[PDB]
Subunit: 184 residues, 4 copies
């Protein structure tokens, strides 16, 4: 890319590939010790959870299982109660299992709270959450998140499975999507 | 069919076509009066609910909507908590809506109780139930069913959308499946 | 007279009489090997529930649910499957039971989809056929009624989720969209 | 050494090196028009997460979830779609990203199913290819590794839902089998 081209020199990287890897290595170990007697079913909500789940799972030295959900919005209902449409439910019964929801981000949205309560209605022994990223407004929802990768500022973030209009999920880092007019 | 052929002359009919139609007409009228101000979203769980839903809807003189779910078993989990796998969820937000689940049968299974609690977690104004049939072992499970077609004995029933190994759903009546050896 | 209905196109008794004829014809055509009735939600509900009961065979019934893929659906008929058939149709006779056929390409695509799943045969029974259905090259074996090019409601067919519970087929009144 | 694993077939570094080369080749081949990467759950998870990050283009990612239709799946490859693609692929380049290819007919049916949805093209990238994959006539443009006919686990691949989180591809030990 020529140096005369007017565009930002570096798109603003919030968490780089090595930082993510180091932190998931630590979380993996802590999770492996906490679940030593009874490995969890890792549950991920598509599509945001793809990278964190593939990576974190490989840092957990237990016989974990992996299962997925796909969800869509019910419009104004999703905003007010966190209810989502289940496009793809869990494949497996979680009755009497330890379940670990693995999230890309938590914030002031109510969908994680509603999903937690949904999975707790299915008889599991326990349901906990591991989230890569937490924003400041996550404090406004009353939920206990046992494992947190990083606190981040309130920015629109992309990469590491997070998109903007379906793009940028394949970035190996977490970046801030540019909002301002670039000037040379 | 020749008279020398060794086969029963009549299948044991529990509720005939006219009895179902007369009773659904009465349920329809009662439902229309109760929901005059705010018509319900009729919810049916496939495939059992097809005939009762098509028919009851047409006996309700209000602007109802209709929506559907499809579900499958999670094995032992379904027997112990009623939890089922959602294969197709509601298409519509039921936030602040009146919802009427229209059932083919109620019994000692926990799935209706779990489904009622699942829909109540999505912010509806109210969720009630209309069921065509109710067996004696439904008394075990504490749920309030506002509209009941018929209390029936404990028999394996078929017809009127109810199957045995996928068969007999298109009988216009509700019959008792025979398992005995026919003798001439 | 319903105020959202311009006029009744097909009354409850006409539908019932016609489905009784279709049912008998279908029962004769499939006497050796009953079909799997397939319906696409939600428009097929009434016709399927009523027709199935007029077919004196041991039919099975299965359902799909679909969403649009936007511009792709218009150009090829492809749809997004939100609920697939629950049962294998390999070596089965399948009878798609439709509410309406017209110039839309989703039926044609669906047919080609089901024929890619190994069935012995796939045929169509449609309650209603509009004039513009002639523009798509598909053979529909059973047809309830030819109707004119009107937006139709009732008997499971909706406008903006309403009127599916009318026991007849009506023409939607322009006062509901003007 | 893991006790359920008889031996390691492909180690973590080998998989990483190979996906780095595939990523580069893919990025050159699609430079003008990035692909929608399509993965079928759950086996494609690791290969898709990793390969996507080695492709320096603005790719998209979409997923499917499938079940068997029993005897029909064996004879034609047809599967029951539990979750379909979320996105229209009309006039798009598509790249199905697979965990294994072999004599099973499901990839062939899926390829033909996607080609019925109007895409500009559909190609396949597969991490692993077994010997019996020669028996199905499909053109697979990108192949990570040829492997022998073994039941393989790890790197997203399971046995009875276990071992998906191994960071290498192993051969399952017959003591578990
Ligand atoms: Mg510069
Ligand atoms: Mg998420
Ligand atoms: Mg039921
Ligand atoms: Mg239709
Ligand atoms: Mg419509
Ligand atoms: Mg695969």
């Amino acid at each position: 890319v020529p140096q005369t081209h007017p565009h930002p020199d570096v798109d603003r990287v919030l968490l780089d590939e090595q930082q993510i890897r180091d932190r998931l290595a630590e979380l993996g170990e802590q999770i492996a010790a906490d679940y030593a007697e009874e490995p969890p079913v890792l549950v991920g909500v598509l599509r945001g959870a793809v990278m964190v789940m593939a990576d974190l799972a490989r840092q957990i030295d237990l016989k974990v299982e992996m299962d997925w959900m796909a969800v869509s919005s019910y419009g104004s209902g999703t905003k007010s109660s966190g209810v989502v449409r289940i496009l793809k439910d869990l494949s497996g019964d979680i009755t009497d299992r330890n379940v670990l929801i693995v999230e890309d981000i938590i914030d002031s949205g109510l969908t994680l709270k509603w999903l937690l309560s949904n999975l707790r209605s299915r008889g599991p022994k326990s349901v906990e959450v591991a989230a890569l990223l937490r924003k400041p407004d996550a404090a406004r929802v009353d939920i206990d998140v046992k494992y947190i990768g990083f606190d981040i500022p309130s920015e629109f973030v992309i990469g590491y499975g997070l998109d903007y209009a379906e793009n940028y999920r394949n970035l190996p880092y977490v970046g801030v999507l540019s909002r301002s007019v670039y000037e040379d």
